[model samples]
Target: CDKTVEVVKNAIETADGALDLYNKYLDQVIPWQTFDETIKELSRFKQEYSQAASVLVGDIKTLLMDSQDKYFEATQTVYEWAGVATQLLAAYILLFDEYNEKKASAQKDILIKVLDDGITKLNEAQKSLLVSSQSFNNASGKLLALDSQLTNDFSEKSSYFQSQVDKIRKEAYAGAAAGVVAGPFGLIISYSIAAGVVEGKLIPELKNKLKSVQNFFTTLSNTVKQANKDIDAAKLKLTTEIAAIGEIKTETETTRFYCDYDDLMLSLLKEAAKKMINTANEYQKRHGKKT
Candidate 1:
């Protein structure tokens, strides 16, 4: 009950924030000189955007929430699994740079947590509806076994509800549970939590780090390019006097030593690379380069 209340409160807060941002941005989008006319136009635009948003959001809700059984969408679709899988894959790509980064366990946990979160919320939403539905017995059977199947993604249990939903929707709701099976509130909460967990904590810390790592290499490439140009344009020559004979050396040669300190190297190299890439991108953008 507390969780449900929290969900409702957070949702309201979120919607209010969106409205506030829209109002703030809307003011900027119109000209003050034509205040009245702009207000009318802006109002119209807002209506249209809201309507479109509603249409899309509603369609999603209908597809996912209108089902008879909350767990019906679980194994019926691949969408949820695929989404979590993508996140895990991205996370580990960067994780490889650091220590174990709990490679196997982190992915497993995220995949498990995200789906369970959705299912738990779905069950919560289904409590009233499952009992009232015309297909109560069938739906209850699905709901009763939902958590267990979801706990394991239906690997150990028979996918009865998932199968039933698939038969009814003709596989239209595959992955529906992840996004829609939970009541709209549950769906929204789960999705927001999933994305928040991914983007805020996991993605930036784990998944998006791969992009950062790649950017690091890009920075190194640009640095090397700049170094080459600098060396070529130096107009400075290095001369080494050997036994009365002087020789001009055009190239600067150097070597780096790598040690077996795992965490140390990850911290130094990974962070340096990531920072260098970000800094270089900022520099390039300021100087009119395509970063």
Candidate 2:
């Protein structure tokens, strides 16, 4: 379990370090003033994503450590009770003859009643233990599922942003190429338009292209905003689920402790039985009936 914690923690730290490396790489890209605003926005978005991801990783780390401890505790409790149940049966076997011989005695009756009750309680303890064990497994499974979900969400969003940036960069280059080609052609076209020739076709064509560029920026802004909202909502959802896991873990531990009470009582009975048998043997020895 300690090793598991170390491994998980190291992985999370490595992921954080990788994000730092990515941000550094991003800074090395073109520092043109034309895209300065976008550069800042991209840097800010990456930082926020990294911060949110680190927080979630911490949440999972805490959950894993807590669940692992609970699992071990529950397993330990079950084995201890099993050992007690075996000891109880052995004690009963050792004292069976005395119980049979003293069947009509109140002392024998009391011991039999306790022994019977203890055995039944032991069985019930195991049943409850089974439930707690399963709960622990389920909680761990939920954590694992959430871990995968968050990592995938982070990766996908990062890629989505990168793709958007790539599209914009390509458009910038294409627009530059178009501007270079249109320079001399634009002078000729303006002269023709001033002469009332090619006005309808060329003017409308340029207008439509300008409209398309405006629409692209509008759509991209809306999409980015919506994606940010969805990511924020996902972070909230993950936190809620993590809280639920903690509650389930607490409930499992509570159930286990309740079951432990029965186990403790049954173990106490084994001690009482030993004392009872030891006294009977001592009396037999005094009466020359030691065997």
Candidate 3:
């Protein structure tokens, strides 16, 4: 869980940061007079992308597959529906889906339908993941809330409840269980103490609480089951998506597009340096005060 979460964080940070890095420098150099400041900044910016390119030896596809590998390694544990694992896996898919959606949306290719379908399925999986997460959270929250409510009842009524329960044959219920409330007799005794006239609402209320807790657990179990189903569905979708990407990777032209996507991104950084240098020279020509 920790592994997958960090993996996605690293991916998001790198993807977003790499995109922004040179673009910021692209604007920074425009105000420089001589090529001195501009060139030096360019040198530094180039170094940043050099390291960025090393992260993906060839392209975005390789990194995408690498993420899959890392996710596999990280998620080989008890992954809960709303736990960090599902959350991060959803985010990871979403990040890639965002790119694929945009690229597929704009992409005019032979596997256009397959690409579009991949995005659609990815988006569906994202929806399931989010639903599973929220449901799990909700179930667990109520479960805890019930426990606190029961605990508060016991604590606030400590002396009275103790006296009443102690009044009963204490030896019989001495070593009772802890989880889910204590034996009903202890509770019934407390309620009987408070109920006064009738056998009391305490019995019914406990009965109601008994079912209520049961409902909460039922929901908890169901949500976990559904989450597992969601993963199965999403993984199947990804299986289809991977094939779509493979098809997209195939071509009748000079070369594969995404295979060289890493280089493409790197090339843009290199190109930015040249463009910024040219822009700086032109800007100096116009605003010649600081020659």
Candidate 4:
């Protein structure tokens, strides 16, 4: 009975910790309630752009594309696994609650069955959590792949912009004579010099500089466009995974929505497990204490 109590205590604590772990990552989790909001946020392509007096569009290309809301990708793995983890926790909690109730059997054979079933519940919880963890990793990786690509695009654009400035220094006096302004980059050189209002429609080095960096603008725009597309696809994929995770809660919702009744129910289950452990220890001690 003491050995059994020790094992049961461990089982209860493990399941309880699993439930608590999910709650720790709770804010990162996207609940069923926020499905619409999450999707809407993802669907948005909120980048904006404008030209300075219908010129020097390239000057502020970086500023035009600053808002990106696709950072939700990394949390997808945690969101998904936590849902199923809670599902498994609830399953085990309920099983342990029953296990505790029947554990103090007057006869030996039925007591064995209680212990047997308790072990079974623990095994099932372990296996289920293991399976969901693998699937969550795969799902999280896909979302992160798109995010990495987006990050690389941002890096590439920054690098290209820097290169253009550096080359201006390396490929000397031509732009010097044309007033391309050797030192400072981007906002400084492009606007002041390129469109530096000279005598008659004088699109000084600015027009030439525009042609040189024209490809940069195209690259930036297309990369920005593709990032939005990837986020859209990732969001659509999230909807499907969210559906799967929600289905796991179908049975759970019958217990009256996760977290609503869950904390109380789990508290009760923990109490039940504690009662069983104490009672089992008492049973084992009875032989020494009583006739």
- How would the candidate models be sorted by TM-score, starting from the highest? 3, 4, 2, 1
* Model 1 TM-score on a 0 to 1 scale: 0.17
Model 3 pairs in collision: 59-262
Candidate 3 clashes: the total is: 1
- List, residue by residue over 15-120, the lDDT tens digit for candidate 2: 2222222122211221223223432333222332334444543443444344334323433432343334344435443543333334223333332333333334
Output the TM-score of candidate 2. 0.27
TM-score of each: 0.17, 0.27, 0.28, 0.28
Which regions in candidate 3 have their CA more than 4 angstroms from the true location?
Answer: 1-198, 252-291
Question: What stretches of model 1 exceed 4 Å from their correct place?
Answer: 1-86, 89-112, 118-291
Candidate 3 vs 4: which has more lDDT: 4
User: How does model 2 fare in lDDT?
Assistant: 0.35
Query: Which digits, one per residue and each the tens of the lDDT, describe model 4 over residues 112-225?
Result: 333333333333433433433333333333334434433343342455334544454454434444544443213234323333334322233433444433344454444444
lDDT of 1 by residue, 30-100 (tens): 22233233223322212212233334323322322332122233222222323343344345336544434
Tell me the RMSD of model 4 versus the true structure.
17.1
Off by over 4 Å in 4: 1-66, 69-208, 252-291
Off by over 4 Å in 2: 1-49, 96-100, 103-291
* Each model's total of backbone clashes: 3, 0, 1, 1
